[PDB]
C-alpha cells in the first residue's frame, strides 16, 4: 500500500520527462530547424556528399 506511492512519483517523473521529451522534440525541432536553411552550404554539403557519390559511387 506504501509503495504504490513512491512508484507513482517516479512514474510521473518518467512520464513527465517523456512529455518534456516530446514537447522538447516538437518545439526544439520546430524552432531550431526553420532558420538553418540560409546555408547554401547545406547544399555545398549536398554538393560534398554528392561528390562523395559522383566519386564514391564506383
Amino acid at each position: 500500500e506504501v509503495k504504490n506511492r513512491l512508484d507513482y512519483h517516479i512514474s510521473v517523473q518518467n512520464m513527465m520527462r517523456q512529455k518534456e521529451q516530446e514537447h522538447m522534440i516538437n518545439w526544439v525541432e520546430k524552432r531550431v530547424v526553420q532558420s538553418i536553411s540560409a546555408q547554401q552550404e547545406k547544399e555545398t554539403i549536398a554538393k560534398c556528399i554528392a561528390d562523395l557519390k559522383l566519386l564514391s559511387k564506383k
Binding site: 506504501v2 509503495k3 506511492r5 513512491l6 512508484d7 512519483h9 517516479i10 517523473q13
Partner: protein, 121 residues
C-alpha cells in the same frame, strides 16, 4: 505466535453433548476446516523493498528513505482473542467427562463384573 500443537481426534470430536455445544462441534469442525485450509496456505513471508533502488528512483524523494527506516521500524500487534474459554470449558467439563462420569460409570461397570462373578455361580 507459532503454531499450536493440538491433535484432534475428529471421531471423538463431534460427539460431545454438553448439549449447548454438540451442534457447535459439528459446525466448529467445519468452521475449523475453513480456518485450517486458510492458514495452511498463507504465504509465510511477504517481501520487502529495495530501499536503495527506490531511494534513487522516487524523486518526490526522501520518500523511499523516510519509508525505509519507518517501514523497517513500523511494527505490528498480533490479532486478539475471542472465545478462549475453551482451555477451561475443557478441563471442568473434563472433570465431568472423565472423573465424575468416569468414576460413576466404572462404579456401574464393576457391579455387573461382580455380578458376572456371581453369575459364574
Amino acid at each position: 505466535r507459532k503454531l499450536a500443537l493440538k491433535t484432534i481426534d475428529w471421531v471423538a470430536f463431534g460427539e460431545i453433548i454438553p448439549r449447548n455445544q454438540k451442534a457447535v462441534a459439528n459446525s466448529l469442525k467445519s468452521w475449523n476446516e475453513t480456518l485450517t485450509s486458510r492458514l495452511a496456505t498463507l504465504p509465510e513471508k511477504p517481501p520487502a523493498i529495495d530501499w536503495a533502488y527506490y531511494k534513487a528512483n522516487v524523486a518526490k524523494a526522501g520518500l523511499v528513505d523516510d519509508f525505509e527506516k519507518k517501514f523497517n521500524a513500523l511494527k505490528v500487534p498480533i490479532p486478539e482473542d475471542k472465545y478462549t474459554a475453551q482451555v477451561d470449558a475443557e478441563e471442568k467439563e473434563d472433570v465431568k467427562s472423565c472423573a465424575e462420569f468416569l468414576t460413576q460409570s466404572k462404579t456401574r461397570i464393576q457391579e455387573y463384573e461382580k455380578e458376572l462373578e456371581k453369575m459364574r455361580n
